[PDB]
């Protein structure tokens, strides 16, 4: 039902190694669909998913020009940032941006986003009202003052409520075979004895889409949150994701442990046990 579209900007200064590199990637949910890299041989927006290939030449030109124009803008932002923090031109710095929209089942706006970071720290964020801003420090307050004066919030709002949701709805239709298909995880429990009196039970989830999932071990029906080792969800490389959870259990106590799996591809949550 619910879906997202996000664009991600990274702008990285590199004094002595040319002008700041600017990279944009766009996602619908967990599917990458477009890319731009100012270091490319001939920088342009490029398709990264088959359903975006349907877009005509006018689309690709417009998108490429936005990226080219934003490369300049984000290069100026880096220069401005140096001044705001009293920094020298000899250091390397990074501005990031994430913006976009979520839609619910009916395709209407659930919420919009537009936020920036400087050197990995929150800088400024458009609030959920799409009307005001939160600045993280006195430097970003300077930016806020500028954006308040130029009514930037109002312009973001018109995008987020119009073009953002309209284009996302188009993408969801064109890529419905994949974007609107949830692939449930394949699950199993593995058993690795580590010593005579302790064994590792590892609960696997493979080949699932989208990325969101919950894997939990219970002992006697009790969540072992503190005792569970969880790896970060990782991409398989074929659009799908993998995850595992593990616990070290006393030898002879394996059957008191159940793995629980929740994912939107499943009709109901799964319970697994070590099948000796």
């Amino acid at each position: 039902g619910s879906h997202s579209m996000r664009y991600f900007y990274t702008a990285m200064s590199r004094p002595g190694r040319g002008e700041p590199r600017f990279i944009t990637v766009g996602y619908v949910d967990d599917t990458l669909f477009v890319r731009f890299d100012s270091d490319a041989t001939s920088p342009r927006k490029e398709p990264r998913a088959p359903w975006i290939e349907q877009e005509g030449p006018e689309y690709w030109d417009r998108e490429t020009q936005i990226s080219k124009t934003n490369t300049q803008t984000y290069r100026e932002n880096l220069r401005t940032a140096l001044r705001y923090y009293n920094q020298s031109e000899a250091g390397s710095h990074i501005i990031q941006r994430m913006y976009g929209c979520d839609v619910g089942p009916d395709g209407r706006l659930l919420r919009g986003y537009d936020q920036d970071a400087y050197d990995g720290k929150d800088y400024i964020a458009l609030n959920e009202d799409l009307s005001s801003w939160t600045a993280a420090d006195t430097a970003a307050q300077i930016t806020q003052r500028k954006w308040e004066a130029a009514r930037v919030a109002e312009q973001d709002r018109a995008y987020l409520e119009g073009l953002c949701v309209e284009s996302l709805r188009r993408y969801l239709e064109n890529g419905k075979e994949t974007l609107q298909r949830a692939d449930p995880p394949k699950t199993h429990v593995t058993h690795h004895p580590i010593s005579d009196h302790e064994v590792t039970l590892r609960c696997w989830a493979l080949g699932f889409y989208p990325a969101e999932i919950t894997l939990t071990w219970q002992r006697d029906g009790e969540d072992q949150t503190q005792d569970t080792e969880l790896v970060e969800t990782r991409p398989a490389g074929d659009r799908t994701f993998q995850k595992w959870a593990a616990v070290v259990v006393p030898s002879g106590e394996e059957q008191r442990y159940t793995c629980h799996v929740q994912h939107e591809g499943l009709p109901k949550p799964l319970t697994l046990r070590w099948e000796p």
């Binding site: 664009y7 936005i66 803008t73 932002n77 940032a81 920036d116 130029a150 973001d156 073009l163």
Partner: peptide, 9 residues
């Protein structure tokens, strides 16, 4: 589709 307007810090 991207928003064509981006504003200076």
């Amino acid at each position: 589709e991207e928003f064509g307007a981006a504003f200076s810090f």
